[PDB]
Amino acid sequence: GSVQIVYKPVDLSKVTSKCGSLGNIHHKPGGGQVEVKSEKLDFKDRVQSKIGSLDNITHVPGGGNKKIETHKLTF
Amino acid sequence: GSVQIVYKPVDLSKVTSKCGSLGNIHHKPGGGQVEVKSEKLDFKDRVQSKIGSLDNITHVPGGGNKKIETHKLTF
Amino acid sequence: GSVQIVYKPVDLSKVTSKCGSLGNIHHKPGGGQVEVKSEKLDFKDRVQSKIGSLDNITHVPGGGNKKIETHKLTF
Amino acid sequence: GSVQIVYKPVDLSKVTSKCGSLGNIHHKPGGGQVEVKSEKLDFKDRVQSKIGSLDNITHVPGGGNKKIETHKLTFR
Amino acid sequence: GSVQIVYKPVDLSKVTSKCGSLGNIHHKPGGGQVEVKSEKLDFKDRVQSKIGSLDNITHVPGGGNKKIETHKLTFR
Amino acid sequence: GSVQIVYKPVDLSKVTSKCGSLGNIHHKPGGGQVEVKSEKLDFKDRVQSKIGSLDNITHVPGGGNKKIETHKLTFR
């Protein structure tokens, strides 16, 4: 007899990452005044000082996608 | 007799990651005044000083997606 | 007799991760005044000092999705 | 007998709009899947047959104000 | 007897708009999948058969304001 | 007996728009997939058959304002 195979899979799927800060309204972060007085300090070894007032950051190592959709027909 | 195989899977799936500080309204974070005074300090070893007032951060190692969807027909 | 196989699964699934700070209205966090006076301290070993007033953070290692949907027909 | 008509309406109306920004607008429809099986599709008079098509309008006026005003005088 | 008609309507009205920016407008419809199977498609009078088309309009006027005004005097 | 008609309507109205920027407009439709199978397609009178087309309009006037004003005087 005859054989018919009709292999017609359909994909409309929507994998998405929405990461960080994306839809905020009137966000308005404010830093206050900062004062740093330093007279007779002694540092004998390596120094990594940071001074700021507003340190506003969005950092995203994340998000990203893997989509793996493999098809096989064996007769 | 005859054979018919119809292989029409349908995918409409909508998988999503929504991560961090997304849809906020009038967020308005405020730092207060900061004062550091330092006379005669001694440091024999390595220093990682941070001074700020508002340290506003969104950090996202996360979110992100994996979709694995394999299809097989064997006659 | 004749054989018909009609393989028509349908996927409309919506699995989602919602993580961090997503829908706040008039959030308004406020840091107070901060004062740090330091006279004659002695540090013999490594120092990791942090001074702030508002330390507003969203941190998200989490969220994210795995979807695994494998389809097989064997005749 | 005689007729005097004095049609003197006076209009000082305002219709006004102030806007700081019309921002981000994201019109992104999707058709999904549609399947029709038959022996016939058979349409005979004024049929608005609309299988799986999309009709999409984005209208974004910076101000969209309307004033509609009709003055009628009829005499017989 | 006699008829006097004085028709002197006065318009000093304003229709106005002020806008700071029309920003980002994204109009991105997607058609999906459409399938039609038959022995016949058979259309005989004024049929608007619309299988899987996209008909798309973007209309973004810096001000879209309308004044419509009709004056009618009718005499018999 | 006499008729006097004095049709003297006065218009001093304003229709106006101020805009700071017309921004970024991204009209980008995509047609997806359409399939029709049959032994006949058979169209006989005023048929607007429209399989899988894209029809796209982008109207962006720096001001798109309308003043329409109609005067009629009818006398018998």
Taking every pair of Cα atoms in chain B, the longest distance, rounded to a whole number of angstroms, is 98
Q: In chain E, which among 27-56 make CB contacts under 8 A with chain F? A: 27-56
Taking CB atoms and an 8 Å limit, are D56 and F32 in contact across chains? no
| CB contacts, 8 Å: A19 with chain B | 17, 19-20, 60, 62-64
Q: What CA–CA distance (Å, rounded) separates E21 from E65?
A: 16
Of chain D, the end-to-end C-alpha distance in Å amounts to 15
Q: Which of A36, A46, A59 sits opposite B36 (nearest CB)?
A: A36
Burial of C14 (0-12, 13-18, 19+ CB in 10 A): exposed
Structure determined by: cryo-EM
| CB contacts, 8 Å: E32 with chain A | 12
> Is the separation of the CB atoms in B57 and A57 below 8 Å?
yes
Taking CB atoms and an 8 Å limit, are E35 and D35 in contact across chains? yes
The chains found to touch D (3+ Cβ pairs under 8 angstroms) are A, B, E, F
| DSSP structure class, residue C31 | P
> Is the separation of the CB atoms in B6 and C7 below 8 Å?
yes
> Is the separation of the CB atoms in A17 and A65 below 8 Å?
yes
Instruction: Using alpha carbons, list the distances in angstroms from residue D60 to B6, D57, E24, E62.
Output: 47, 10, 11, 9
Strands A57-59, B16-20: pairing is unpaired
Q: What CA–CA distance (Å, rounded) separates E38 from D44?
A: 17
Residue C16 contacts A where some CB pair is shorter than 8 Å: no
DSSP F4-72: EEEE--EE--EEEEEES---EEEE--B--EEEEE-SEEEE-SS----SS-EEEEEE--S---EEEEEEE
Taking CB atoms and an 8 Å limit, are B28 and A32 in contact across chains? no
- Residue F41's DSSP bridge partners are E41
**CA closest to E71 among chain F residues:** F71
Taking CB atoms and an 8 Å limit, are E62 and F62 in contact across chains? yes
Q: What CA–CA distance (Å, rounded) separates D9 from E13?
A: 12
- The contacts of residue B4 (CB under 8 Å, 6+ apart) are A3, A4, A6, C2, C3, C4, C5
- The contacts of residue F5 (CB under 8 Å, 6+ apart) are E5, E7, E73, E75, F73, F75
DSSP E51-64: BS-EEEEEE--S--
Resolution in A: 3.2
- Closest to F52 (Cα-Cα) out of A1, E36, A58, E71: E36
- Closest to E45 (Cα-Cα) out of F39, F36, D48: D48
